């Protein structure tokens, strides 16, 4: 009986480690001997250690992920796609935890429950990727949504943080209601909630005889809810406001982690929910609109975080290009784009957090950065060019292969929109590089040097971005392996 | 045995060495940059000597895997057409270094480093036999030249000229990239030796030719897109103009000779 739980040690470990960290923090924060120590950095380091140990548990136990698959069949399904998605998710969480260490000291964020809630959200997303049922997917989505609602309003005294948390909670609850109504309408029309059953019942009757109103409506509502979750327009109701008002270490996590898991869910819904290519049209329109709106909205931004939010929306549209073209080479392009975008976003948010110790708010603030810190300016310019998609950098490979996938299915209209949006994006990305190097402001802002964690993260990510084209084979190999394993 | 690998790695080592040298040692930076440029030029001259002039096959071929299924890979080779372009693009760099000798105390290491990266990226352009990677190194030159035009410009107009050059180059680049993608999907590979032995349908030849012309005509200004060249030429350092007039204007002609015409 104990060996049936060999498939859930990575989750059991992280759950128990979160419990131990919570007990440790609550016991020793409210202590008289140690004069109420602000043990946020301690809990952060121990949580990073826990993440690394559960990464070791999950990665090493690769043959054991299919163990007791019949017993766990109704609960979750673990396969090669889940394995790599979960490993990438743990890596991103560890990177975010590493970045947010300096936030706890200079700004004096002494609340240790931030790390505990991050770990609980990580557990929710681990259960999300392997979820093979509507019920499990909904529960994991709600768990991570609550863990994010709580930490979005962590800055209680801040006007922006409270409003951002309120807007985030309202939007997320509305999206969850729409998704949940879609799930109810699907369950009431087919009588099944498991993905295997829901694939066997829908794969044959491909609207050949008539269009099932209930099934079509449920599919549409689930798609709409998921589109709210990833903030693809016109379902970006308050996403820029949430990104701006949220704390920067918090904004770093929501910009990366909630996207990997939700995209995994959308893929595991496409494996069965391809009902008459209905989602392919919805994602087609959503991707075009997302690229256009992100490109046309990030040029009218003077703040760094709003520009990052609109960049995230544009890259979500670029990724949804892969959804619109349903093929192995489309899903592979989608996953490569997700990986590259996550790494670039981690790079950019580490750079922003490095300058956040001096309260950077506007693009003009980073005006004379090429004179005071002439290597941080180079790193930020590299990240901006990678966002733009300049050929020599790693950001070009994702857009290249996504455009190739789009042209494979024969959608020539998507390619033209992507090209125009790429031109606009490159313009407003090199606009930032103009400020750092070419302008000569009268007043300069001097920043204090960053710490070791963010310096190492920036160095590694910048070496990845510039030198990815030389050795891109492993990423393509693992991505092609994941895309094929979605069905066999 | 002198091959194309060493000729490309010499500027790489030259740029890496200067990357980690203190800026106070101005003499050492200039000496090492000039020595690297001269060594690269001598390497090119030696490559000329051992060049067979009786075979149409590409010589000194080198391969390095890029995609996991060897669909597209780093294929480097020279022929009687691109040999002199390589020699010229390695000869011009030491002259550019020597131009800014007196004033180098103000530019710093980022000047010689930018020129060495330029040389590394332009040697690979004339040596690539893969259509897609020829585009990758074709439009990687923008970043070093963008930095050269903007950081070390003459007046405040340097921002406008850099924007115009970059925007025109992007407009050509992506419209050519779409054609490259269409060729890759249909043919199956992007190797020049395979693309030169594939019978393209008559209808697709005009569209692909126009798309290739869009990117190349900008870099060899015909008539309607010759309005960026004068502004970029005037708003550039003395050595920067040599690169734009000596090499960057030879990309369009070489692109027409190597890909479009066959």
């Amino acid at each position: 009986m104990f060996n049936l739980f060999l498939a859930v040690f990575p989750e059991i470990f992280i759950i128990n480690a979160t419990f131990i960290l919570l007990i440790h923090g609550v016991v020793f924060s409210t202590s008289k001997k140690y004069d109420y120590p602000p043990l946020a950095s301690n809990v952060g380091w121990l949580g990073l250690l826990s993440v690394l140990i559960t990464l070791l548990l999950l990665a090493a136990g690769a043959p054991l992920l299919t163990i007791a698959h019949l017993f766990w069949n109704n609960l979750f399904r673990r396969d090669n796609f889940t394995y790599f998605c979960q490993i990438f998710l743990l890596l991103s969480t560890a990177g975010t935890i590493s970045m947010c260490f300096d936030f706890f000291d200079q700004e004096r964020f002494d609340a240790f429950e931030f790390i505990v809630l991050i770990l609980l959200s990580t557990c929710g997303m681990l259960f999300m990727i392997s979820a093979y049922d509507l019920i499990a997917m909904y529960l994991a989505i709600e768990l991570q949504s609550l863990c994010f609602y709580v930490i979005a309003a962590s800055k209680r005294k801040s006007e922006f943080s409270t409003e951002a948390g309120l807007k985030y909670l309202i939007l997320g609850a509305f999206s969850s209601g729409i998704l949940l109504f879609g799930c109810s309408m699907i369950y009431g029309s087919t009588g099944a909630t498991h993905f295997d059953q829901l694939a066997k019942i829908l794969t044959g009757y491909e609207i050949t005889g008539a269009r099932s109103s209930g099934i079509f409506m449920g599919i549409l509502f689930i798609a709409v809810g998921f589109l709210f979750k990833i903030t693809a327009v016109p379902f970006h109701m308050w996403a820029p406001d949430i990104y701006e008002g949220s704390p920067t270490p918090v904004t770093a996590f929501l910009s990366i982690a909630p996207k990997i898991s939700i995209f995994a869910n959308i893929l595991r819904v496409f494996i069965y929910g391809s009902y008459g290519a209905t989602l392919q049209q919805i994602f087609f329109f959503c991707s075009i609109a997302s690229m256009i709106l992100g490109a046309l909205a990030a040029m009218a931004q003077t703040k760094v975080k709003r520009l990052l939010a609109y960049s995230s929306i544009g890259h979500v549209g670029y990724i949804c290009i892969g959804f619109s073209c349903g093929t192995i080479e489309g899903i592979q392009s989608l996953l490569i784009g997700i990986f590259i975008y996550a790494l670039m976003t981690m790079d950019a948010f580490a750079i922003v957090l490095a300058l956040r110790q001096t309260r950077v708010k506007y693009i003009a603030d980073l005006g004379a950065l090429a004179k005071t810190n002439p290597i941080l300016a180079i790193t930020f310019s590299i990240t901006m060019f990678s966002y733009a998609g300049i050929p020599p950098l790693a950001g070009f490979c994702s857009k290249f292969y996504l455009f190739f996938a789009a042209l494979g299915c024969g959608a020539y209209f998507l390619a033209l929109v992507g090209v125009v949006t790429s031109v606009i994006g490159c313009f407003y990305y090199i606009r930032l590089v103009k400020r750092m190097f070419f302008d000569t402001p009268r007043t300069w802002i001097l920043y204090e040097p960053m710490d070791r964690n963010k310096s190492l993260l920036l160095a590694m990510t910048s070496f990845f971005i510039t030198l990815f084209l030389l050795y891109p084979s492993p990423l393509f190999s693992v991505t092609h392996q994941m895309a094929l394993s979605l069905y066999l | 045995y002198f091959n194309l690998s060493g000729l490309i790695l010499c500027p790489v080592l030259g740029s890496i060495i200067l990357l980690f040298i203190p800026n106070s040692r101005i003499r050492l930076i200039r000496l090492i940059g000039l020595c690297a440029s001269l060594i690269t030029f001598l390497y090119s001259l030696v490559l000329w000597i051992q060049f067979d002039s009786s075979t149409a096959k590409f010589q000194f071929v080198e391969s390095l895997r890029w995609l996991p299924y060897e669909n597209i890979n780093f294929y480097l080779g020279i022929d009687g057409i691109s040999l002199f372009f390589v020699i010229l693009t390695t000869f011009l760099i030491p002259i550019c270094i020597l131009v800014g000798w007196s004033g180098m105390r103000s530019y710093g290491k980022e000047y010689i480093i930018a020129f060495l990266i330029c040389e590394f990226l332009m040697i690979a352009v004339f040596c690539m036999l893969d259509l897609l990677l020829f585009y990758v190194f074709f439009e990687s030159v923008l970043i070093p030249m963008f930095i050269i035009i903007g950081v070390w410009g003459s007046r405040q107009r340097k921002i406008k000229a850099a924007y115009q050059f970059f925007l025109y180059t992007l407009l050509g680049s992506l419209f050519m990239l779409l054609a490259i993608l269409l060729i890759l999907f249909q043919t199956g590979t992007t190797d020049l030796q395979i693309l030169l032995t594939t019978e393209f349908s008559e209808r697709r030849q005009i569209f692909l030719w126009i798309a290739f012309f869009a990117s190349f005509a900008v870099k060899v200004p015909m008539v309607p897109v010759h309005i960026w060249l004068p502004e970029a030429h005037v708003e550039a350092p003395t050595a920067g103009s040599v690169i734009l007039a000596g090499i960057l204007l030879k990309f369009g002609t070489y692109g027409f000779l190597r890909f479009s015409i066959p």
Binding site: L293, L296, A297, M299, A300, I424 | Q164, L167, Y168, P224, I227
Partner: peptide, 26 residues
């Protein structure tokens, strides 16, 4: 050059994106 080529070019009239990007607040 300075006239039709510039007005129909990238900045004579293609700078309407300033009158287009700023409208995205709607």
């Amino acid at each position: 050059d300075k006239g039709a080529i510039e007005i129909l070019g990238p900045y004579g009239i293609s700078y309407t994106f300033r009158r287009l990007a700023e409208r995205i607040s709607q």
